[PDB]
Structure formats: structure tokens, C-alpha cells
Design a protein around this nucleic acid. Structure first.
Ligand SMILES: [Mg+2]
Ligand SMILES: [Mg+2]
Ligand SMILES: [Mg+2]
Ligand SMILES: [Mg+2]
Ligand SMILES: [Mg+2]
Ligand SMILES: [Mg+2]
Ligand SMILES: [Mg+2]
Ligand SMILES: [Mg+2]
Ligand SMILES: [Mg+2]
Ligand SMILES: [Mg+2]
Ligand SMILES: [Mg+2]
Lengths: 90, 78, 88, 166, 48, 115, 183
RNA sequence: AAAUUGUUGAAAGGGAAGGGCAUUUGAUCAGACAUGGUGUCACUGGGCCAGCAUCAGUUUUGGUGGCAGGAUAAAUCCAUAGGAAUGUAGCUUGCCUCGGUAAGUAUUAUAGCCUGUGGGAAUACUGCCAGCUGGGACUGAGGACUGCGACGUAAGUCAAGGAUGCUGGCAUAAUGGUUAUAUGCCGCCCGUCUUGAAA
RNA sequence: GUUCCUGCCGAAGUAGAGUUAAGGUGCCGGAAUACACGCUCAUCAGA
């Protein structure tokens, strides 16, 4: 149904599993490998805790390898003065 | 400055915001000509009708289910 | 801070009350303004919503269309331009 | 537009009991081929009686610069009518290519004499192989050894409405 | 017959522009009108 | 010291197709225009008005009217690339382009390290 | 970029400064003008004199206010609002004497008027047309310049302290490691 | 009877009454889904609104791919004989701040350069593509089917003779109207004239 | 002297989007106080 599925993880930043519209989202160039988490069961009709824990364990496992990523996901983002989005590489 | 280019669309011409074309009505017999065209037309009681006749016209219009554009005129003000 | 937008000024009308000219900070060239096309504008309590349509001139001023036209007393008033709908 | 040089040759049509008439070659400077052909014709009626109908173009060709790396000294001959009377002029332009030299020539001529491209007529552009034949002084200025001078008009636009620093 | 069958083409003004600032001189003189030969292709595509 | 246009004066193209590339002047056409070749940088040899280009303090020996191969050899011998890299101006240019290059995650790393 | 912009009047042309300020006000920016007595006008002294006369407020600030009001459509609501946004003063009154004052390059006389061309100082014009306060303002300005010299000495000391602090920060590791890694 | 004049009464205001503009504070009025059904407060269908997806028309803006032509670009590069000065490498002479100075031959040497001239090409420009892919903006006109089509083994499906689908909210609201003071700014006899408009 | 409103034919239109001529880009006013040349500031400067 064209709703992207996202996890905080709730462990890291307190954002649970949720549906988000694609156009209201910016994509950064940094990646994590999603192969660890399987992400087949939950679907659109399902949305109409334990699953989030299962997903979060696998995703944290990959998060640990990259330095400082947990801190990045924990903190929020905002535009400071003098920040021009068009130059800003996200 | 008025000119033909300002002319309104035919399908929307002569239409009130309620969507009913106004038709003048003098008596019950003229009201009954609008029996089924309740969607297309709405009745308007003429200025020269007496108060006694207006209540009869309103009752018959309610019975027929025809919208009256100016009820409570000369039975109420404004 | 919780700002996820850039507050921009409303300059004037196109000269046409329907179209409004918006000056956005830190935008000197049309190329810089090309990023902001399609973004949602919000004049702020009551809020009127709109969107950025196209660039205007070489100074980086952009055209904007609101659902209801601005009252013309807001020339120089502060106006918000959000990042969504994002194209990045 | 930015100029282009063109070799143009036209035969002026064969007729009965007339052998193939001599090829009339010229070197036009024009933005495009069409203007070059028309310039060729316009030049040709002056030399002798012709017309577009009475003749044809044999070969239009673009000629690029042989050495667009080397800086060269060109002697340019210009003739035009200050409307009532017409007079010659010899200028010397230091430039890398013949076409760029002609571009600068036309800019300078329009600046100094209020004359258009149509009014101006170019005879012949010649490269000067050896220096000390440069009779003009302003060109001879730049041939001195170890030439050095500072940048003039150094001041630039502020680009901001209000400057705190000055 | 085939050409007459075609209706005269209705063309918008060129998207890029007319080129020279002033149109009303002949092509060699530096204006829009006149015989421009192959360069018509550049103009028409901009207009179409 | 004085910044002078002369044969062997290395210069930087502030605007153009190059969008910033070092070149060495080989010959001076006139006051407003000069001929430059940047064989290491990759800019083609060309005549340019001095308005587009800004001079740099560095200089090196160069015969006037030298061809591109000769200018490349002289550039290599002078090693003006390393000299430019040493200068604070080149460091500032690299600084600013690095500033734009950073990602939001990298910017957050910067913020954390600052604290 | 600031809630309020304080523009010095010295070495500026009335028309260009007024146009720039009027444009800023129409965009909502609040601007205050000070030291308008030493504002400049192109031409000769007589011509500006007779211009202000064929208009005939004597103060330089009022002349600047008229010149700026000529830009703005004051009779409209928007123009009136732009006008209350403006402030003009002869000399620097408090509290702006403690705030640095920007310069508009577009209206600078040094950058605009060619050497060897007659100009006119608005203070002399205002005094000639009947503004009998040019004398008191000059003494206040002299006192302000003495205070500004003291402030400049303090600022030089502050810059020396800033240099020492910058040196101190240099021998710290974290900034150096951050710069090498990124930013 | 109008037109006109005078006394008395009420109100506002200021030397004229007077307007327009802005702000201020208030007072007062209008503001549906009576949503069709089901279930033991929950779900479902219609209509209004907001967003998104996929399309169609119109144009705008990028990025990028392929191909043809030219002097099969011309340069450059590597070659390459001849030639020169803006005359290198040196030697010689005079004088020498004992290291630089001055100019005679010097045609490549402890620099280079220009022509003839061989090879290999690249790039630039022009032109074509019924080549891809991205971001914008305005339009959604039509109301059972019919046509040209495309693909589908086939059945059927579609971007093919004009917009449909998904998500969310859908009201004492969203808001809209009227009226009154106070505060200040501007204007301020009338006609014409004027710009676009007072002036 | 003029001749209710609208439309039509003819010597010698309304609204949205885009493009563009003539023009213009200090402000009122929408557009570079952009570039590049030659000039000129004259007691008739010059719009
Ligand atoms: Mg009546
Ligand atoms: Mg355009
Ligand atoms: Mg009283
Ligand atoms: Mg489309
Ligand atoms: Mg097109
Ligand atoms: Mg190819
Ligand atoms: Mg090829
Ligand atoms: Mg050679
Ligand atoms: Mg060859
Ligand atoms: Mg597209
Ligand atoms: Mg139209």
C-alpha cells in the first residue's frame, strides 16, 4: 500500500515499528545491512511488542559494527541558522 | 466592461446556489406544473399575492415537495 | 530547537492576487531555488497553506500559490516553508 | 554571434561557347554559412557586374585555425564608409586565432565609429611572422622582455546589501 | 494535393527565443525575417 | 608581495568550465587577455580574459611561448602542486569543500566530538 | 539576519540609502538610521538648497525621512507600517551608541561618486535652511569619538585575549582529531 | 406644495462638521453529515475536505546514453628535416662593488621556439535518435458500449476516442458576517486636469 | 453635440498554463544597483 515500514529501533531511540509515507521522509547516504532481520511476517493488514523485540535484536546486531551509529539514531535532527538545505548533502 | 466572453456556461446558467432554477408562481394551479421537477426547479411566490393565499401555496408546495425560494415573506420580514 | 523548516518572507503579488512572491533566506540563484519547488508553505492563531510553484527572477525569489490568497497586508510577514514533500 | 571563417568559391555559371569561368575564391568572416554566402555575393557585385541569379556558389568550407595554441600578431585591413566618404584603416591585433582577432576588431570598430557589421568590409587578415615589423605602438608594447604589471580594477562587487566590516 | 490537404501549421513562439534582440531586419543584416536556409530547422523545433 | 601577471605566473580559474584548476601563463596577448596552460591540472591551453582568473603568489621559471609538454616538465620540476598544497589558501579551499561534502551522520559525529 | 539593523549615515547618498532602507522596510526588516546630519547628496550646495527650498521640516533626519517616504506608498496601510518600522536620528542617541553599525556599500559616496565632482553635506544644507542644532550635535559626536577610541583600545585588548585563547585551544587534542577526521 | 428663513429640543464636535487608513478593545448573529446498513460500544457503503500512488494533455527544468559529418574536425601528443629571435648554451673583449655587469659571433648545447611534415587519434562544434531516467507547475474537460490499437500460446489485460485508486479527518467547529468605541497616520473649498492614482 | 445594452459584417471575447514582440530590471514596481567595451560630467551636464 505504498507505506514504508520503519523501526527506531525502539530500544535505541524509542520509535516503534510504524508505517510512514515516503514523500514525508529524507533518505541519508549511510546504510546498515538489513539481511540480519528477516521482515516477512508483518504486513499491511497486520497493522489494522514481541515482534518489535525480534526485529530490534537483529537490527541492533548490525548497528553495533558501525561506530557511533547508535548515538546518531538516538539524537534528533533540526535546521540550525545558516543551514541551507539545497547545498546540504544528506 | 461587459462583453460576451464573460458569458456563463449553459449547464450552469440561470441556476441559484441551491441549484434550482427559479420559477414564478401565482396560484396553486401554477404550482402544480412543478410537481415532479423538484430537483430542477424551485417555486417563487409572486410579489402581488395576498397573505391568505401564500399560506395555501406553502402548504400545497410542502405536500408536493417543491422548494419555495421565498417563504416567510409577508408572513415574516427578511 | 524543533525547527524542521525555513521561515521566509512574503514579498508581494505577481504584477494578480493569486500568485505570491516569496523570498527565502540563503538563496541567491534560481538554481538554489530549484530545490524548494513543490514544498509546502504555511503562513501562521490561524494558518494558511500553500505550495511553491516556480522560480522568479535571478535573485532567488520564488512564486507561490495558496489555497486562499494572502490578504495583501502580509507583505514582509514571516512565512514557513517545510521540507516535505521531500525529493531527496 | 561568435564568428567563423569561411572559404567561399563561386564560378558564376557556364554558358554556351563559354568555358568554365575562373574560380573566385574569398575568405569571409561570418557567424554562419548563409551569411558568408551572402557576404561573398555582396563583395562580388562591387568587383564586377554579377548577381545571385547569374551565378552560383561552388564550395563553402569552414577553415579552422592551424595553431590555436600560439599567440600571433595579425595585421587587419578595414574599409568602411563614414557615411558620405569611405576610407581605409590598418590595425594590428595581438590574438591567438584569426577569428577571435576579427571578433575583437568588430567590437572595437562598433565602439569607436558607431558602425555596424554591414558597413564594415574586411579586405585581408595577415599574420606577421617576425616582430619589429609591428608598426603600431600598442601592440609593440606587449613584445617587451619580461613583461609584468599588476591587476587593475581590483575592487569587486560586495554581493551583500549590508556589510558590517567595511 | 498532399500539401494542400495539410492545414497551415499553427506554431507557438520559440521556447528559447528569437535569438537576435531585434527581429525586423533581414537575416544577414541581423534580424529574424528572411531566408535562413538550414537554420530554419533550429527555429521551427524551438517553435514546435 | 606584488601579484603580477607575467610568464610563469601560476593562476587559479575562479569561474569557467574548469570551476577551479591551476594553470600557468605562457604568453600575454594584451592587458585584458592572456594565454594559459595547466597540463597537470587538465585544463586545455586557452586564451582567457584576466577577469575570470585570479592570480596566486606562486611562480616558476617558464620560457615564453612554451608548448604543453614543456610546461608539463617545468611544472613537474617546480613541483608547484606540492607548494600549493602547502599554502593556507589551498587548505582553506579543501576545508570548505570538505564542509559541504559531509553527511548528516558525519555531521552528528562532528557534533559529538565537539562536546 | 538581525532583529534590528543600525545603519551609519556617514559617507552615504540620501537617495541610494533611502531606497535600500525603504526596500528593507517593505520586507519587514526593522532599520534605524543614525548620524544623518553628515549624509551626502550629489550636485552642488546651491542646487540641493533650492530643491529643499522649493519643497518649503529643517532637520537632516526629516529630509531623509521625506526622501525615503517618496519611495514608500505611505498613503496605503503597508506604507504606513513600513514608516513606523523606520527610525532616524541625528547623531547616535542611546542605546544604539553601544552597538556596532553596519555600512551599505551600494550607497557609499567613496564607492559611488567620482573624485573631482562636487557634492553636498546634508548638515550644512539643514543649517542653511534654518536648522539651529548642528552645533550641539557636533560636541556630542566629539565625546562619542573619545568614547569610541577608548572602546577601540578595549577591543584591541580583547583581540589579544582572543589570540591567546585561540592559541590555548590549539594545543588541545579533540579539536585537532576532529579536524583531521572531518570538519 | 417644494426651494427658503427663524425659535425651541436632542446629539456630536471643535474651532470647525468633516472623511479615508491602521491598531485597539469589545458586543452581537449564521455555522449540516438529522451518514445509508450491520454487529453485542464495534465494523462497513455514500458525500465534504487533506495527503499520497498510478495515469492523460500542456509546457518548464536537469542528469545521462548511443549514432553521423567536418581538413573523417583543427589542436595536443609522439615523430620529424629546415628556419628564426623575444638569442639559450657557451666562449671572446673592457671594466669589474672580486659576482654580477656590457654585446659579437653564437641555430641547441646545462632553455626552448616557428614552419615543412608522418602516424595515431581524442576532444570541440553542428546534426539525428520512433535513447533512458529525475524534479516542477496548470488542466481532470467527457458520463452504458461502439474506433484506431497494443500486447497476450490463449484467455484476457492495458498507458489504446478526456481520472481513477489508496490513506486520514469530516463540525456546536473550519470559520464567515454585522456593529460600536478609544488610539494614532493621512487627507481636507469646488470645477477641470493629471498620471495608474491622491497630488 | 451625444444617442438604452449586446452582438455581427466590414473599405481606406472570458479564465488557467507556457512562450514572446515592443519595452524595461534604484524604489513606488514584476525583473541583474549583471557583465563587457568606448566615452561625458558643460556656467546651457545630462533622464
Ligand atoms: Mg416589491
Ligand atoms: Mg524563459
Ligand atoms: Mg450638550
Ligand atoms: Mg505527466
Ligand atoms: Mg516541447
Ligand atoms: Mg564518438
Ligand atoms: Mg568522431
Ligand atoms: Mg612544431
Ligand atoms: Mg595531419
Ligand atoms: Mg518530465
Ligand atoms: Mg489568454
Amino acid at each position: 500500500d505504498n507505506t514504508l515500514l520503519i523501526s527506531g529501533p525502539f530500544k535505541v531511540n524509542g520509535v516503534p515499528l510504524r508505517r510512514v509515507n515516503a514523500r514525508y521522509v529524507i533518505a541519508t547516504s549511510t546504510k546498515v545491512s538489513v539481511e540480519g532481520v528477516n521482515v516477512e511476517k508483518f504486513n499491511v493488514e497486520y497493522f489494522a511488542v514481541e515482534d518489535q523485540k525480534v526485529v530490534d535484536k537483529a537490527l541492533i546486531a548490525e548497528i553495533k559494527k558501525t561506530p557511533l551509529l547508535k548515538q546518531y539514531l538516538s539524537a534528533s535532527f533540526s535546521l540550525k541558522n545558516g543551514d541551507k538545505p539545497h547545498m546540504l548533502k544528506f | 466592461q461587459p462583453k460576451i466572453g464573460y458569458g456563463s456556461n449553459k449547464k450552469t446558467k440561470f441556476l441559484s446556489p441551491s441549484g434550482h432554477k427559479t420559477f414564478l408562481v401565482a396560484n396553486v394551479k401554477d404550482l402544480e406544473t412543478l410537481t415532479m421537477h423538484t430537483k430542477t426547479y424551485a417555486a417563487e411566490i409572486a410579489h402581488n399575492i395576498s397573505a391568505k393565499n401564500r399560506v395555501v401555496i406553502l402548504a400545497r408546495a410542502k405536500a408536493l415537495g417543491i422548494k419555495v425560494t421565498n417563504p416567510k415573506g409577508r408572513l415574516a420580514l427578511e | 530547537s524543533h525547527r524542521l523548516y525555513v521561515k521566509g518572507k512574503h514579498l508581494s503579488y505577481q504584477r494578480n492576487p493569486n500568485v505570491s512572491l516569496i523570498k527565502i533566506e540563503g538563496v541567491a540563484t534560481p538554481q538554489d531555488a530549484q530545490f524548494y519547488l513543490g514544498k509546502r508553505i504555511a503562513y501562521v492563531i490561524r494558518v494558511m497553506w500553500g505550495k511553491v510553484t516556480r522560480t522568479h527572477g535571478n535573485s532567488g525569489v520564488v512564486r507561490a500559490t495558496f489555497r486562499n490568497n494572502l490578504p495583501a497586508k502580509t507583505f514582509g510577514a514571516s512565512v514557513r516553508i517545510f521540507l516535505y514533500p521531500s525529493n531527496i | 554571434a561568435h564568428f567563423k571563417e569561411y572559404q567561399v568559391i563561386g564560378r558564376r555559371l557556364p554558358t554556351e561557347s563559354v568555358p568554365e569561368p575562373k574560380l573566385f575564391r574569398m575568405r569571409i568572416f561570418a557567424s554562419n554559412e548563409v551569411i558568408a554566402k551572402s557576404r561573398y555575393w555582396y563583395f562580388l557585385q562591387k568587383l564586377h557586374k554579377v548577381k545571385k541569379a547569374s551565378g552560383e556558389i561552388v564550395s563553402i568550407n569552414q577553415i579552422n585555425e592551424a595553431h590555436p595554441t600560439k599567440v600571433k600578431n595579425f595585421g587587419v585591413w578595414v574599409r568602411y564608409d563614414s557615411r558620405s566618404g569611405t576610407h581605409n584603416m590598418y590595425k594590428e591585433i595581438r590574438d591567438v586565432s584569426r577569428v577571435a582577432a576579427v571578433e575583437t576588431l568588430y567590437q572595437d570598430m562598433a565602439a569607436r565609429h558607431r558602425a555596424r557589421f554591414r558597413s564594415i568590409h574586411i579586405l585581408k587578415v595577415a599574420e606577421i611572422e617576425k616582430t619589429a615589423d609591428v608598426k603600431r605602438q600598442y601592440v609593440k608594447q606587449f613584445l617587451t622582455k619580461d613583461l609584468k604589471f599588476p591587476l587593475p580594477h581590483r575592487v569587486q562587487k560586495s554581493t551583500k546589501t549590508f556589510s558590517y566590516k567595511r | 494535393q498532399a500539401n494542400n490537404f495539410l492545414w497551415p501549421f499553427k506554431l507557438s513562439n520559440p521556447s528559447g527565443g528569437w535569438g537576435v534582440p531585434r527581429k525586423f531586419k533581414h537575416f544577414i543584416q541581423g534580424g529574424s525575417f528572411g531566408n535562413r536556409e538550414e537554420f530554419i530547422n533550429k527555429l521551427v523545433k524551438s517553435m514546435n | 608581495n606584488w601579484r603580477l601577471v607575467e610568464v610563469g605566473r601560476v593562476v587559479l580559474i575562479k569561474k569557467g568550465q574548469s570551476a577551479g584548476k591551476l594553470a600557468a601563463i605562457v604568453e600575454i596577448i594584451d592587458q585584458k587577455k592572456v594565454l594559459i596552460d595547466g597540463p597537470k591540472a587538465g585544463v586545455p591551453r586557452q586564451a582567457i580574459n584576466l577577469g575570470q582568473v585570479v592570480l596566486t603568489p606562486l611562480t616558476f621559471a617558464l620560457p615564453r611561448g612554451a608548448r604543453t609538454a614543456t610546461v608539463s616538465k617545468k611544472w613537474a620540476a617546480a613541483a608547484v602542486c606540492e607548494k600549493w598544497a602547502a599554502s593556507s589558501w589551498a587548505k582553506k579551499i579543501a576545508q570548505r569543500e570538505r564542509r559541504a561534502a559531509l553527511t548528516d551522520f558525519e555531521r552528528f559525529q562532528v557534533m559529538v566530538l565537539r562536546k | 539576519v538581525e532583529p534590528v539593523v543600525v545603519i551609519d549615515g556617514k559617507g552615504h547618498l540620501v537617495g541610494r540609502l533611502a531606497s535600500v532602507v525603504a526596500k528593507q522596510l517593505l520586507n519587514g526588516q526593522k532599520i534605524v538610521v543614525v548620524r544623518a546630519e553628515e549624509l551626502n547628496i550629489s550636485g552642488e550646495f546651491f542646487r540641493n538648497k533650492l530643491k529643499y527650498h522649493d519643497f518649503l521640516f529643517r532637520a537632516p533626519s526629516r529630509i531623509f525621512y521625506k526622501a525615503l517616504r517618496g519611495m514608500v506608498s505611505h498613503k496605503t496601510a503597508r506604507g504606513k507600517a513600513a514608516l513606523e518600522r523606520l527610525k532616524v536620528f541625528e547623531g547616535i542617541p542611546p542605546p544604539y551608541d553601544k552597538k556596532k553599525r553596519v555600512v551599505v556599500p551600494q550607497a557609499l559616496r567613496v564607492l559611488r561618486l567620482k573624485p573631482g565632482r562636487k557634492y553636498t553635506t546634508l548638515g550644512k544644507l539643514s543649517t542653511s535652511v534654518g536648522w539651529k542644532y548642528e552645533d550641539v550635535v557636533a560636541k556630542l559626536e566629539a565625546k562619542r569619538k573619545v568614547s569610541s577610541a577608548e572602546y577601540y583600545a578595549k577591543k584591541r585588548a580583547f583581540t589579544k585575549k582572543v589570540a591567546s585563547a585561540n592559541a590555548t585551544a590549539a594545543e588541545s587534542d579533540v579539536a585537532k582529531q576532529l579536524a583531521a577526521l572531518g570538519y
